[PDB]
Design an enzyme around this catalytic site. Structure first.
Site, PDB file in Angstrom:
ATOM      1  N   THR A  54       0.804  -1.208   0.000  1.00  0.00           N
ATOM      2  CA  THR A  54       0.000   0.000   0.000  1.00  0.00           C
ATOM      3  C   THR A  54       0.851   1.278   0.000  1.00  0.00           C
ATOM      4  O   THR A  54       0.427   2.318  -0.499  1.00  0.00           O
ATOM      5  CB  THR A  54      -0.934   0.002   1.202  1.00  0.00           C
ATOM      6  OG1 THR A  54      -1.544  -1.288   1.331  1.00  0.00           O
ATOM      7  CG2 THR A  54      -2.006   1.064   1.040  1.00  0.00           C
ATOM      8  N   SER A  86       0.473  -7.484  -1.078  1.00  0.00           N
ATOM      9  CA  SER A  86       0.963  -8.480  -0.114  1.00  0.00           C
ATOM     10  C   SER A  86      -0.004  -9.627   0.166  1.00  0.00           C
ATOM     11  O   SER A  86       0.418 -10.672   0.652  1.00  0.00           O
ATOM     12  CB  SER A  86       1.440  -7.855   1.215  1.00  0.00           C
ATOM     13  OG  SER A  86       0.374  -7.656   2.131  1.00  0.00           O
ATOM     14  N   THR A 146       1.133  -4.360   4.333  1.00  0.00           N
ATOM     15  CA  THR A 146       0.953  -4.592   5.775  1.00  0.00           C
ATOM     16  C   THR A 146       0.245  -5.906   6.128  1.00  0.00           C
ATOM     17  O   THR A 146       0.602  -6.563   7.111  1.00  0.00           O
ATOM     18  CB  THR A 146       0.213  -3.427   6.466  1.00  0.00           C
ATOM     19  OG1 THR A 146      -1.071  -3.229   5.858  1.00  0.00           O
ATOM     20  CG2 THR A 146       1.030  -2.152   6.385  1.00  0.00           C
ATOM     21  N   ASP A 147      -0.738  -6.276   5.310  1.00  0.00           N
ATOM     22  CA  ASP A 147      -1.595  -7.438   5.544  1.00  0.00           C
ATOM     23  C   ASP A 147      -0.859  -8.716   5.894  1.00  0.00           C
ATOM     24  O   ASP A 147      -1.325  -9.493   6.727  1.00  0.00           O
ATOM     25  CB  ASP A 147      -2.479  -7.708   4.328  1.00  0.00           C
ATOM     26  CG  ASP A 147      -3.716  -6.856   4.305  1.00  0.00           C
ATOM     27  OD1 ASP A 147      -3.978  -6.140   5.294  1.00  0.00           O
ATOM     28  OD2 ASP A 147      -4.444  -6.917   3.295  1.00  0.00           O
TER      29      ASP A 147
END
Lengths: 177, 125
Positions: free
Chosen positions: A11, A47, A78-79
């Site tokens: 992101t 991700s 981030t996920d």
């Protein structure tokens, strides 16, 4: 003195798929004075598409660079950031330098982005000489194997679980905890 | 290399576990209740797990966020069935540790040792 920044997308790099290269990400985030940096776009992908084979390549690459740089930063969606960071911690038992995963909830091209802070946090820690695998996020540095993504819509997305925060960038200082 | 992560809820049977082994999954992580709940009445889970534990590694962590698992003190039960505790590991560290171990070994007795040893600070042992 010398740090490598390795892009995997996420992101932070979108204009979740990494439109922006890692070097461009650092620029738009606003870290200008970094030529004593180098950059390597390993992935450029959302991700949520991360697979165990992706871990292998990253670690292979990381192994090519631990004796070459003083510190290493990996930017990430981030996920699944914490899955990668946890797995690399096992694959790279006892790194000779800091290796620091980070990313952002808001893309760096937005003016509200948390990317500036997370990137300055990772930089400050990668130049600290404190070895190991870590996650840098929202001012805090957490052990890679102790980090989990805990909130889905907040800047303070990550937490050290059952372990104390490693360090924290306060102003321009790295305060080790 | 492949791993299944199931959250323990009420009204959940062994049948799905049997099917994961039967699909070639190599490990199972269970998010137990609290410090390591394992239903032992009105449930084939304790039976089924007691079977599959000696085939693939069956790992027990918690569905809570903080505080690992302490089967030593439902827990002792599961431990005596073949359940491998995740202790205070995060869910991410637990999954990736297991996988890392798998690609190295297939033997459940060895996995239990490695899963219990602190390798990189993931675990308080």
């Amino acid at each position: 003195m010398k740090i490598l920044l390795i892009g995997m997308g996420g992101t932070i790099a979108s204009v979740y798929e990494a439109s922006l290269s890692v070097k461009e990400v650092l620029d738009i985030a606003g870290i200008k004075d970094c030529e004593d940096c180098d950059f390597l776009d390993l992935k450029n992908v959302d991700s949520t598409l991360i697979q165990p084979e992706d871990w292998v390549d990253l670690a292979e690459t990381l192994y090519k660079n631990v004796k070459k740089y003083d510190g290493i930063i990996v930017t990430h969606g981030t996920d699944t950031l914490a899955y990668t960071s946890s797995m690399i911690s096992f694959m790279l038992r006892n790194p000779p330098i800091p290796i620091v995963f980070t990313g952002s909830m808001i893309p760096a091209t937005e003016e509200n982005s948390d990317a500036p802070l997370n990137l300055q946090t990772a930089i400050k820690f990668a130049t600290s000489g404190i070895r190991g695998v870590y996650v840098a996020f929202n001012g805090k540095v957490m052990l890679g194997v102790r980090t989990s993504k805990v909130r889905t819509m907040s800047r303070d997305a990550f937490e050290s679980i059952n372990y104390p925060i490693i360090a924290e960038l306060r102003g321009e200082d790295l305060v080790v905890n | 290399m492949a791993v299944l992560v199931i959250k323990l809820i009420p009204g959940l049977s062994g049948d799905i576990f049997r099917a994961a082994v039967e699909l070639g999954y190599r490990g199972i992580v269970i998010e137990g209740y609290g410090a390591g709940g394992i239903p032992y009445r009105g449930s084939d889970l304790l039976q089924t797990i007691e079977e599959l534990s000696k085939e693939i590694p069956i790992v027990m962590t918690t569905q809570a966020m903080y505080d690992g698992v302490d089967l030593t003190r439902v827990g002792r039960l599961a431990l005596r069935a073949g359940v491998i505790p995740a202790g205070d590991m995060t869910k991410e560290a637990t999954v990736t540790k297991l996988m890392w171990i798998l690609g190295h070994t297939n033997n459940v007795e060895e996995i239990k040792v490695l899963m219990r040893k602190n390798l990189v600070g993931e675990l308080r042992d």
